[PDB]
Amino acid sequence: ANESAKDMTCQEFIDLNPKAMTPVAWWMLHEETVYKGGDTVTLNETDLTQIPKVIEYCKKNPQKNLYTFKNQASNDLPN
Template identity: 45%
Template sequence: MTYKALCSIALASLILSSAGGAYAATTPDNMTCQQFLDMTPEAHSPVILWVVSDDTINKEGDSFSKTTVDATVLPKVVELCKKNPTKKITSFKQEIAGFFKKM
């Protein structure tokens, strides 16, 4: 399986178990910032990684730990979403990728 397939399985599992039927049809590709903010915090990092997974965010081949993503990228994404709750989280793809490049 590819990395994206594994991420989608893990993310779908998190969304279904944490949000119940209300967000069952929601994926990061069509998720609004408000839906992102309403999710359990444990699901935030996988969603962020999903949003930027099509792009190469780490050309040197290093890895990012969940702790690092939670500490550096997540607060900036939450701030963007609080200011723009009706926008889709994917509309911030370039900004999120930029946050990874600054790590």
């Protein structure tokens, strides 16, 4: 266990099963959070737009880490 989704490389992300790619995408994009400002853990329209972009941006850059794709994304949550 714990081969590390946060250390999965982008070439490996685009090669994992497309069933389990969907949970991986939000786990990363919302960075395993406890959720702040409320409990509205639903997919937001930014999130729904980013689910394809976190895949495209990996096949476009196969050398990158999977979890650094959080740095671009705002989601909805407060600082």
